[PDB]
RNA sequence: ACGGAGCCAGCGAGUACAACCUUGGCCGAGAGGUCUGGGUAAUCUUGUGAAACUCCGUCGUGCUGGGGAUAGAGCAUUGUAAUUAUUGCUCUUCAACGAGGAAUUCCUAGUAAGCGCAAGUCAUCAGCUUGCGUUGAUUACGUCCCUGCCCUUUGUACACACC
C-alpha cells in the first residue's frame, strides 16, 4: 500500500499489455518475474484493485490469477491514458 | 523495505514449500512433486498415480 | 622464583604470545571446529562485538573489569584478543555474565551460561 | 578361572605319552582331560600331525578331528 | 527441459492436475467437467469439456484467449504452441462432475 | 539424389499400454509401406514410480499405507533411414497421450 | 592336456602366490605395515601382520585376472565389510583407500598389473606367466 | 608353532608400570590389562618388540620388557605417527603426548580437573555426574554413579 | 569372536540453471580431499562384486580376545551457526548384562527367524519406515479350553440402547 508510485505505474502498464497477471503467493521475494518490482507489491496492487470493482481473482496452488473486467479496462485506461483500439486480451492481435 | 527481513533459507524444512497449500509437514519431494501428501492423496489419480499393488 | 604455577593455555608454550597472536595464528593453533568456522565465510560474527570489546578495554577504569559486552552471538569462540573482559551470554532470558580467563581458550561462549536450570529432587 | 592353562616341560611330556592309541583326537577331547587350554591343545594337535603318529579325519577350524595311525 | 523421462511425465501429470483444479474453480459458472490435454510437436491441444460451451468460448475468442495467456504465464510458454477448444459433452448425465457442479449450484441458488 | 542416412532413434515413453502398443504398431506398418531397414520395436524395462504414503492426514488410528505408483512404458524404434523419410513419419502417426520423440543423431 | 588358473582353488593359490612373493621379496613395502587398520571397520589390525601384504596383492592380482577393469574403489568396496558400529546395527563401508592403492602401485612395478583404458587396471604379459606357473605348481602338490 | 619345552615356570606375574602383567596368556592382552592400553595400541607396540603374538610371553626376556616400556613412554622418538595417541594437542603451542599406566589415570584426573576449572557444559555435567554428550536420560539408565 | 582369504543379490534412486549420483587417477591409517570424467539414465554411478555366509589361522569356556556403554582428547564433513558431543574417523574408557520373573507379542512357507541393502524424510544425521533381495527351519494343517467376534434360540421394566 505504501508504494513508490513509479513501481505501481509499471505494474498497471504490464497488466494492460497482457490483460492478465500470474502472481505467486510468495511474500519476501526480492523481485517479480517480468516486472522489476517485488512480488508482494504486485499482490498489494492487485488486492487494491479487486476491492474497488474489477478484477476477477483466484488463489489456487499459491498462484493468484487476475483478469480485467469491462470496468477494469476503463479504469486502467484512465490511469495510463491509451484512448481506444488497444492491446489487453479482449480480442486478438492479428491471426493467432 | 526494512533490511533484515530474511534468515538464509536455502535448505531444510522452511525452504521446501508445497505447490498447493504452503505447508512444511509431510511434503512429497520424490519425483519433484513438491506436494503435501494430503493434497497428493486427494489428486493422486489425476497426476497419473494409481493404486495397483 | 620464575614460572608462575604453570602456563594457562592451548597446546605447548606460554601466555605472552597468546595475547598478541590475533586470529590467523590462533586458527592455525586450534582444534578443527574453530578452523572450519574461520575457513567458512565470516560476516557479522566478529564485526560489532569485537569493536565493543576493544572499546570496553580502552574506556575501562584500569585494574577493575571492563564494561559487560552483551552478546546474542553465543556461537562465538573465545579468541585471546579479549581475555579479561566480561561478556553477557544470552540464554533467551538474561544476558548471563561469563568471565573470560586464560583457561577458557578456544571454547564457545554458549557453553558457559546454561539455558535450563538444572535438575533437583535427586542428583 | 578353572586353571589348566599353564605351560610346562612336565606337562609337555605327559601330552606326548597321552598321544598314541587314542580313538577321538580333537580340541575338546584334549581339554576334557584337564589339559592345556583350547589353543594350547590346538597347537598340541598340530604337532601330532608333523610326522604321522595321529592322522586326520576332519580339517575344519575348531571342528578338527583326528585318529591314531592304524 | 530437457529433464528425465520419469520427472517430465510427473511434471506433466502435475501440470494437468493444476490446470484441472484451476478450471474447476475458474469455470464454475460455465459448468466445467474435465480437460483432455494432448501434447504434439509445436502445438498442444488443451481440450476442455463443459456444459455451457457458448459461455466458455464467450464471443468468438474472449474468455479462452484470457485463459491461454494465463497458462503461458504460469508455465513459461509462448503464443501458438497452446490452443484451446471448448466442446460439448456427449450426454451430460453420464459425467458425474457435471452433475456435481449442477447440484452445487442448485444448493447455492435455492431449492429443496 | 540425397539418400543420406543419419540413423534416427524414435523414443516412445508413456503410461498407457494399449495406446502405446497401437502407436508402435502404426510406425512399423508405415516403415513396411516406405520399405526401410529398421530394428523392430525395442522394449525397455518399465520404470515403476513408487510414492509410499500413509493414508491418514492426522497420523492417528491404525497405520495404513498406499503405494501410489505410476507405470511407464519406454520403447524404441531404431531407423536406418534418411532425414526426409523421418520428417514424413513424424508428421503422420501421432496419437494423444503417448510421448512421440526423435533423437536423430545415431 | 592344458594347464589353467582356475583348477587350483583360490585359498591354496594365494598361499602359493604369497610364498612365491616371499621367495623373491621384490614386491616392495608400502610404509604403513602393522601401523594400519586394513578395513575402516576392524578393531584389530592383521593377525599374521608380518607377511600378510603378500597374500593381499596376490588376492588383488587374481581378482584383476578374473575381472575386466577393476580400480581402487571397487576393491575397497569388495574388501570392506561390517562395522561393529555400536549398540546401533551394522553398515557396509568400503575398506581403507590408500592400502589397496599401494597394493596396485606395487603390482604395476613388478609387472603383474597393466594400465587399462576407459577406467581401471588389467593384466600384463609377464603377470600371466607367474599366475600359470603358480597354478601348475599347486596342481603338482595336489597330485 | 612350538609347545613349551625346557623346565619353564618363569614367573606367573610379572609386574610392569606399577600394574599387574598377567602370566602366560599374551603380550597384547596382558598390555590391555594395564590401565590405559587397548587392543589396537598394544598390537602396535608388539610389532616394535618383534615378539611372536602366538607366544604366551609370561616367559619373556627382561630386555624385551624394557623396550616395550620405553615405547610406552616415548611416542615421537620411535616410529609412531603421533595421532595414534591417547592425548594429542595440549598446553600452549607445542607437542602431543600420552601415557598408558598410573601415568594415564593421573593425566585423566588432571584433565578432569582442567574441565572442572573451565566450567564448560561438559565439565559442569561431570560435576553433576550425569550425561555430557547430549544424550537423553528420560528413560535410559535409572541407576547411575 | 577376531584377522585375512573366498566372494553372490534384488528393489531402487540420481543434476543444466543448477550443484544430483558421482566411477577412474593422485594425496590421507582414517574420515575425507582433490583434479578429471560418464550419466536427465536396461547405456554412467552399478555386476550398486551388500551383508550374513564359505576357507585357513589367532583366543579357548575367566564380566575373557564376549559386550560395547559411559567418558577424555584430537583429526574430518554439512551448514551462516554444531557447546545442549549433528554425523564420521582416530586412540584411549572399559560399565551393565553368563539367555531375563509376573505377564504377553508375532507367526503356518520361500513364510518365521537371521542378514544386509533401498528409497522415504535429507544441507547434515538411521537404532526409524515403506520396499527389496540373501540364508532359510522348527510345529499344526486341528479345535472351540482361553481371548475376541458372529449368528441362533431364549430373556430384558434397556432404545442417548450396560458408561
Ligand atoms: Mg557384533
Ligand atoms: Mg544399474
Ligand atoms: Mg573388556
Ligand atoms: Mg475386532
Swiss-Prot record, chain B:
It comes from Kluyveromyces lactis (strain ATCC 8585 / CBS 2359 / DSM 70799 / NBRC 1267 / NRRL Y-1140 / WM37) (Yeast). Pfam families: Ribosomal_S14 (PF00253). Transmembrane segments: none annotated. InterPro entries: Ribosomal_uS14 (IPR001209), RIbosomal_uS14_euk_arc (IPR039744), Ribosomal_uS14_sf (IPR043140). The gene is RPS29. This is Small ribosomal subunit protein uS14. One of its GO terms (molecular function) is zinc ion binding. The keyword Acyltransferase does not apply. GO terms for biological process: cytoplasmic translation.
